[PDB]
Scaffold this active site. Structure first.
Site, mmCIF file in Angstrom:
data_model
loop_
_atom_site.group_PDB
_atom_site.id
_atom_site.type_symbol
_atom_site.label_atom_id
_atom_site.label_comp_id
_atom_site.label_asym_id
_atom_site.label_seq_id
_atom_site.Cartn_x
_atom_site.Cartn_y
_atom_site.Cartn_z
ATOM 1 N N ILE A 1 -7.506 5.486 -11.765
ATOM 2 C CA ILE A 1 -8.887 5.585 -11.298
ATOM 3 C C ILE A 1 -9.099 6.778 -10.383
ATOM 4 O O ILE A 1 -10.100 7.480 -10.493
ATOM 5 C CB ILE A 1 -9.347 4.328 -10.552
ATOM 6 C CG1 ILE A 1 -9.320 3.116 -11.481
ATOM 7 C CG2 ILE A 1 -10.764 4.529 -10.037
ATOM 8 C CD1 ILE A 1 -9.641 1.810 -10.778
ATOM 9 N N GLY A 2 -8.181 6.992 -9.456
ATOM 10 C CA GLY A 2 -8.317 8.105 -8.539
ATOM 11 C C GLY A 2 -7.375 8.069 -7.358
ATOM 12 O O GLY A 2 -6.330 7.415 -7.391
ATOM 13 N N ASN A 3 -7.775 8.784 -6.310
ATOM 14 C CA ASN A 3 -6.961 8.981 -5.127
ATOM 15 C C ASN A 3 -7.658 8.554 -3.838
ATOM 16 O O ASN A 3 -8.819 8.920 -3.590
ATOM 17 C CB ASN A 3 -6.586 10.459 -5.008
ATOM 18 C CG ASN A 3 -5.327 10.799 -5.760
ATOM 19 O OD1 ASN A 3 -4.300 11.088 -5.157
ATOM 20 N ND2 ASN A 3 -5.392 10.757 -7.082
ATOM 21 N N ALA B 1 -6.669 9.334 0.225
ATOM 22 C CA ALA B 1 -5.922 10.421 0.863
ATOM 23 C C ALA B 1 -4.421 10.214 0.620
ATOM 24 O O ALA B 1 -3.686 11.158 0.328
ATOM 25 C CB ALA B 1 -6.220 10.467 2.354
ATOM 26 N N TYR B 2 -3.996 8.957 0.746
ATOM 27 C CA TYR B 2 -2.647 8.522 0.421
ATOM 28 C C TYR B 2 -2.724 7.040 0.026
ATOM 29 O O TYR B 2 -3.064 6.220 0.874
ATOM 30 C CB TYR B 2 -1.742 8.698 1.644
ATOM 31 N N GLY B 3 -2.465 6.664 -1.230
ATOM 32 C CA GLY B 3 -2.152 7.560 -2.345
ATOM 33 C C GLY B 3 -2.952 7.242 -3.603
ATOM 34 O O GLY B 3 -4.142 7.556 -3.669
ATOM 35 N N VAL B 4 -2.314 6.595 -4.584
ATOM 36 C CA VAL B 4 -2.828 6.545 -5.967
ATOM 37 C C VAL B 4 -3.275 5.164 -6.455
ATOM 38 O O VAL B 4 -2.550 4.193 -6.290
ATOM 39 C CB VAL B 4 -1.755 7.047 -6.948
ATOM 40 C CG1 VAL B 4 -2.371 7.326 -8.312
ATOM 41 C CG2 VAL B 4 -1.082 8.295 -6.390
ATOM 42 N N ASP C 1 -14.622 2.797 10.123
ATOM 43 C CA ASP C 1 -14.864 3.832 9.110
ATOM 44 C C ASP C 1 -15.730 3.355 7.942
ATOM 45 O O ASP C 1 -15.428 3.632 6.793
ATOM 46 C CB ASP C 1 -13.521 4.354 8.582
ATOM 47 C CG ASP C 1 -13.668 5.572 7.665
ATOM 48 O OD1 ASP C 1 -14.627 6.362 7.866
ATOM 49 O OD2 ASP C 1 -12.820 5.726 6.742
ATOM 50 N N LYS D 1 -2.379 -0.024 -6.235
ATOM 51 C CA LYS D 1 -2.247 1.178 -5.425
ATOM 52 C C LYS D 1 -0.794 1.454 -5.158
ATOM 53 O O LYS D 1 -0.118 0.627 -4.570
ATOM 54 C CB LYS D 1 -2.967 1.033 -4.085
ATOM 55 C CG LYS D 1 -2.805 2.253 -3.184
ATOM 56 C CD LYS D 1 -3.889 2.361 -2.119
ATOM 57 C CE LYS D 1 -3.609 1.456 -0.933
ATOM 58 N NZ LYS D 1 -4.651 1.617 0.116
#
Ligand SMILES: COc1cc(C(=O)N2CCC(N3CCN(C)CC3)CC2)ccc1Nc1ncc2c(n1)N(C1CCCC1)c1ccccc1C(=O)N2C
Length: 335
Positions: free
Chosen positions: A15-17, A19-22, A136, A38
């Site tokens: 799907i994507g990233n 910042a850390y990680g996958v 956040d 993840k």
């Protein structure tokens, strides 16, 4: 392969990233039920990151709520403890996030906005009762799917009750004034600032305070809310002390043609004074969210969340120990 899970799961698409990680979507083998996995590639190498991961596992393992993203599994090490580098967490898979939805050709009616806000606040009421500030909140940290079900995710910044304000940065569009003009009392009102911004973002489908740098950020807030009263202040003080007496622009002139109730609620959230802002609990008693309000279906979290583990100054290896212990603990409770 770079995604060496067992035979319990089957990877579909990446799907994507973060910042850390996958993050890859997957499918559990026996149930055929779709999960998101993840991978955290070198989870123990950098002290600051390992601390984030440990923090985020503990908070997720603490929460059971339809509006907060959830851990369904954490994979055991398949190698010796010394060799163990990459941690895999199985989480709820959603279809999109709220940033994609707001900024798309698809239409976005008040009914959507109303339902999205209700879930957000229902999630936060639970968090805040646990005495956990999200810190956040933004539309990309709010996951969403076809039937408008919403889940809050990404607790890497969360805190109980150093950082530096760098100048040329445009990443503080949802940060509350108390985190900007550093006041010495930070409470869960912080999230309700971000909610106000997010909320308003949906009503215009565009960012309310899109500051290009630290100063442009405070300017944009002032242009709408006016100057903060002397009492609502105390080097940094100087920049504002001498700036022409600014009056608050009414929200009706900001959003022309918007709903009277929506703005009443919005105006209770975007206020300099942290104590002046509604709580999430109270926000849920607002007429705007009356369609959905159900006292018996908007629970608190008990017990509250201890941040002792966070305060303690730990080594890189001791955080690895603790994270591994969360994995073993996770399986002990289930099985
Ligand atoms: C198909 O599912 C999604 C698509 C999208 C999406 O529309 N985009 C836009 C295009 C994006 N580009 C960046 C990556 N590139 C491959 C091009 C696509 C990918 C994210 C967003 C969220 C999706 N769903 C989602 N479900 C679960 C997530 C998660 N996202 N994510 C995303 C996982 C991809 C990056 C973050 C999360 C986002 C915030 C907080 C938590 C999560 C999270 O832990 N999980 C498990």
């Amino acid at each position: 392969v770079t995604f060496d899970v067992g035979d319990e799961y089957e990877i579909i698409e990446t799907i994507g990233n973060g910042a850390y990680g996958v993050v890859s979507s997957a499918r559990r083998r026996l149930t055929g039920q779709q999960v998101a996995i993840k991978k955290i590639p070198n989870a123990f190498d950098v002290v600051t990151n390992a601390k984030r991961t440990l923090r985020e596992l503990k908070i997720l393992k603490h929460f059971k709520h339809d509006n907060i993203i959830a851990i369904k599994d954490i994979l055991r090490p398949t190698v010796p403890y010394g060799e163990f580098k990459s941690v895999y967490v199985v989480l709820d898979l959603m279809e999109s996030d709220l940033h994609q939805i707001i900024h798309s050709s698809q239409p976005l009616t008040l009914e959507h906005v109303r339902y999205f806000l209700y879930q957000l606040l229902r999630g936060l009421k639970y968090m805040h009762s646990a005495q956990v500030i999200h810190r956040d909140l933004k539309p990309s940290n709010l996951l969403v799917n076809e039937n408008c079900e919403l889940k809050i995710g990404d607790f890497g910044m969360a805190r109980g009750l150093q950082y530096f304000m760098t100048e040329y940065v445009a990443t503080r569009w949802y940060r509350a004034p108390e985190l900007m003009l550093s006041l010495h009392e930070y409470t869960q009102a912080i999230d309700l600032w971000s909610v106000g911004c997010i909320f308003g973002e949906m009503l215009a489908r565009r960012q309310l305070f899109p500051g290009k740098n630290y100063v442009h950020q405070l300017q944009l807030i002032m242009m709408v809310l006016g100057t903060p009263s002397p009492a609502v202040i105390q080097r940094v003080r100087a920049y504002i002390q001498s700036l022409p007496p600014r009056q608050p622009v009414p929200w009706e002139t900001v959003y022309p043609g918007a709903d009277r109730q929506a703005l009443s609620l919005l105006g209770r959230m975007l206020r300099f004074e942290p104590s002046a802002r509604i709580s999430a609990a109270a926000a849920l008693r607002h007429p705007f969210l009356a369609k959905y309000h159900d006292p018996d279906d908007e629970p608190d979290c008990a017990p509250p969340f201890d941040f002792a583990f966070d305060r303690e100054a730990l080594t890189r290896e001791r955080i690895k120990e603790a994270i591994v212990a969360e994995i073993e603990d996770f399986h002990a409770r289930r099985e």
